[PDB]
Amino acid sequence: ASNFTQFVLVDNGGTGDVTVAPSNFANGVAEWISSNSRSQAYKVTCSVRQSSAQNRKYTIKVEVPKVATQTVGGVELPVAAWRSYLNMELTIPIFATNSDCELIVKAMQGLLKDGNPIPSAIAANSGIY
Amino acid sequence: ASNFTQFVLVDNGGTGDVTVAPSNFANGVAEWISSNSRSQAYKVTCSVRQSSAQNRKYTIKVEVPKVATQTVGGVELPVAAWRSYLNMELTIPIFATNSDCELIVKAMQGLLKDGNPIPSAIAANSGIY
Amino acid sequence: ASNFTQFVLVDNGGTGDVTVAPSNFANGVAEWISSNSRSQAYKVTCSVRQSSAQNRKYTIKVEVPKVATQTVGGVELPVAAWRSYLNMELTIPIFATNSDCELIVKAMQGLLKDGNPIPSAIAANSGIY
Amino acid sequence: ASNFTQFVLVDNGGTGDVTVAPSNFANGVAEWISSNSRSQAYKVTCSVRQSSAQNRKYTIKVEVPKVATQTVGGVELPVAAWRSYLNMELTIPIFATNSDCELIVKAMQGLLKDGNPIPSAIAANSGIY
Amino acid sequence: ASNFTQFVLVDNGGTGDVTVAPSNFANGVAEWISSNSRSQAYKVTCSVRQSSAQNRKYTIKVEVPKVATQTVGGVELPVAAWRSYLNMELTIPIFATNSDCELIVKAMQGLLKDGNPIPSAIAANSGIY
Amino acid sequence: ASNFTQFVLVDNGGTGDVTVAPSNFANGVAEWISSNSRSQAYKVTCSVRQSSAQNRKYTIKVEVPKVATQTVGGVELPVAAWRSYLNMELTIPIFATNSDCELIVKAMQGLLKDGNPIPSAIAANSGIY
């Protein structure tokens, strides 16, 4: 069941979607990027390992470009002003079954579902109030 | 209106859904828990801070328990056999607009969407290949 | 093309086969893991290195679990009651051609072929008699 | 009955097979040797012992020669230009039944089956890619 | 689709072409080798890394052998009389777009094109004058 | 057989080609540049020397400008953000004949030919996957 394929990272109803495609598999770490320069592209990486005696850990990283007023193909500096970073670590005990892992995935999806508090706060440049 | 509201963490289609409700805001950490004992409850936390002069950082954590009943000294107690921990750190430059932040939210949602590589690998107890 | 793919480790006809899938390639050691709980999964690893100026060495390891349920204090967990460990080291001189390597592989396959003395002894909990 | 018998180590169809025959059983180590000159012969050894209170350990070794003629000072001798060495160690707990042992053997056979990643890498003078 | 595929390293017009095929990806170094013994094979390697915060570096190496048969201790062995080594280091800023990278590739191709000064000098065992 | 002449570094089908012409021969090092400012020009250099007792080494360097969003004739800073560098070293044993050197040139051409893995990865801002 090979799964290292391109997917839609940002869905805009079919027009203007952001697709990321496989770009690197060095050291077993899967990497996806959008069709941009490295400084302006969406980037996804994912790897999993045995973190401890009784846990496995997925390490998932995402880079998102700032798009308002950007210059496509231009040199934008400083780098830290134009990019957002997501660092996500999922620790799962070795006892978890496929059913348990499906539940964990549902928890993450529900956490980030549109209309829920956490995505609402992020989208509104706000905290919890 | 306040964004500190209850939400469905695990959507099972209306029956057996896991709901978490606001439970604490002490020390600037927003907390949600399911309607269980503290030993067996699901848990969600979220905080935001000015990590540096030009970036803001969200710190989001989720705990998924595997519930069980443990006999301690001849008495049965509600415990969690183990817990799965999700840790998300999201750094956003102060220059990001609301539309830029909406892109970040859509990227995360698309990352975890059903059928996409990363959730499929997690649900299947496997890496990406 | 790529040989870091899913494969059938235990061929139980067509139904009930044990399949292992790539999970990790850290430090140049490829790792395959079967699905469901990691505590009960099969494990295969393989690495190759230049052991001397004239020799290359393959290191291959396989773990076969005995699946069981552990119950301690009323808490049930899926575990391996015990595991069987295979450690293989194969040294091949740099002078060997593709034809020579194919012959070496045939030797290993013939060593473990059904009806032959060594697989028969292993399958019968027996030595050589 | 007896498993200390002649067997086909390399199966080259029906003509040109490499057959090894019992030669020695000293110190509880069974040894098979192919025919013709010993300097060029294939070698297989196998022994089993109680490695710990709960484990039995098989030690299996195979030598594959590259046949050649050595000429020193006009004197010709049949030799092996070099040899490939396989060393296998298999540990099986005393609790394993005959069914469990048959499963372990199937795992080894499936590991080395044609088309699978590890035999393919060996036959192609290659690693995992 | 994966870009880790076999390719014709030396094009002789369809007869006598030298083909290299994927052979290893351990430690993040992609390797190709020809269908020969390791002592006589052609070799290609390629890796990419973030050399600094704003540049990426490709490291590409090729080995071209001059094959021969060497008598060592009265036994003939396949060796390389000597090897020619090509080492390429290519540094690209993160701000380069795909079109910018295509220009880099075209520049290298035009540099080595038949009839151009540098390949002519190399083929003629001479410098540029 | 003088060979220090202008050549087409980037071929765009006859219209828009990038030609580089001789611009310096100090210290015996041949240099070509395009018709631009030094900060925005294509630049090629080549020299050859006796690197060791049994090897000669060609040192070939190429500089390629970033063209997307450039400003022709403008001051573009920092320099490292607008230019890509190729450093290529070809080591050839003194025993190699003209025929051997022609084969080496073919190897380089095949390495960089359109549609092959290495140029494909570079053009797509990607590694090997």
Residue numbers in the entry:
A (entry chain B), B (entry chain A), C (entry chain C), D (entry chain C), E (entry chain A), F (entry chain B): 1 to 129
Paper text:
To prevent this, we describe a method to encapsulate target proteins within highly hydrophilic, structurally homogeneous, and stable protein shells, which we refer to as “nanocrates” for this purpose. Our approach was inspired by the established use of natural virus capsids and engineered protein containers for packaging applications. We adapted this concept for cryo-EM by encapsulating target proteins within symmetric MS2 bacteriophage-derived “nanocrates”. Being highly symmetric, the nanocrates do not adopt a preferred orientation at the AWI, and therefore their enveloped cargoes are randomly oriented. Nanocrate densities can be computationally subtracted during single-particle cryo-EM analysis to allow for high-resolution reconstruction of the molecules inside.
MS2 virus-like particles have multiple properties that make them ideal for use as nanocrates. They are expressed and isolated in high yields and are amenable to controlled disassembly and reassembly around cargo proteins by a simple pH-dependent protocol. Disassembled MS2 coat proteins can be stored at 4^°^C for at least a day and at -80^°^C for several months without losing reassembly and encapsulation efficiency. Briefly, we purified MS2 capsids from *E. coli*, performed disassembly in an acidic solvent with the removal of packaged viral RNA by centrifugation, and reassembled the capsid proteins at neutral pH in the presence of ApoF.
